[PDB]
């Protein structure tokens, strides 16, 4: 007795898996997408307490509650995996430590180099 291998079946299955693997697509979360709106200034969301009890809120608090706000930076990593097809490219302020661009350069006769 010898354990002879079924190469036809093994290779056909390998090709099937390869084609599927290399043709897989992205997938977004149909539930997460419904609560957010992507704009040029960041992700936007409504405020919890919009649909709750509000009789004891002041007018300022009610205005803020029925307004909107932006998703906090701490919660953005969730989007990377829940909404792959909608990407917000974060843009913080530039951090340049070149001494020549600082205000004190105006007090010097030349640049540092």
């Amino acid at each position: 007795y010898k354990p002879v291998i079924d190469w036809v079946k093994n290779r056909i299955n390998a090709r099937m898996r390869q084609y599927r693997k290399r043709s897989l697509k992205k997938k977004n979360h149909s539930k997460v997408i419904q609560r957010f709106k992507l704009t040029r200034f960041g992700w936007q969301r409504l405020r919890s307490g919009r649909n709750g009890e509000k009789e004891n809120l002041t007018h300022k608090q009610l205005k803020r509650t029925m307004g909107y706000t932006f998703v906090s930076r701490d919660d953005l990593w969730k989007f990377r995996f829940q909404l792959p097809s909608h990407i917000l490219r974060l843009r913080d302020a530039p951090i340049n430590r070149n001494p020549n661009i600082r205000k004190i350069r105006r007090s010097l006769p030349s640049y540092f180099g």
Partner: protein, 200 residues
Amino acid sequence: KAPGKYVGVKAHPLRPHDQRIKINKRLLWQGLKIMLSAKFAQGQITVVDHFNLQSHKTKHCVRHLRRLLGRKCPSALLVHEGTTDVNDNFRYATAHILAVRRENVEGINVYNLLKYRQLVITEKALLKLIYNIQTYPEKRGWLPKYATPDGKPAPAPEKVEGWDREWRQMKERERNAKFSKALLRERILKWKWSDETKGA
């Protein structure tokens, strides 16, 4: 039969797959041009009248190749158009010269140019190659179009006089800059940020 319990069983086995990758066609075009430049610089390019032979014997073609390229040539790529640049006698004669490889203009690649030390090209094939290289950007759409029946640029019209006078006057007014908060409040009242990702 499981990993670590049988010879020939693997936890992460090698799998059959396609090894082809993708590259920018622009990069391929630029690489072809660089390869031609390199062959010119290194003196591995020869231009021939034609590859038409009157004898099919391998020895005569070998002698011609030796006369042109010397006795120390490692290998050669012979480039022709196919119809009136070369003939069946040449195709028969070169069929047993293992150091030379025949190609048409359509099949020229950086790979071929690097693989074969010498490049022997007919004048017709050289001109065909130059035309293809120079017109490839137009075919691939890397150059601007002009939306005219002839496809050439149209004249640029003149500007209507005083088209920006009101804007200039508004800038002149605002350049005083002493009513900064007032102008800021006016702008806040007049203008609105859009929540859309495309357009204004």
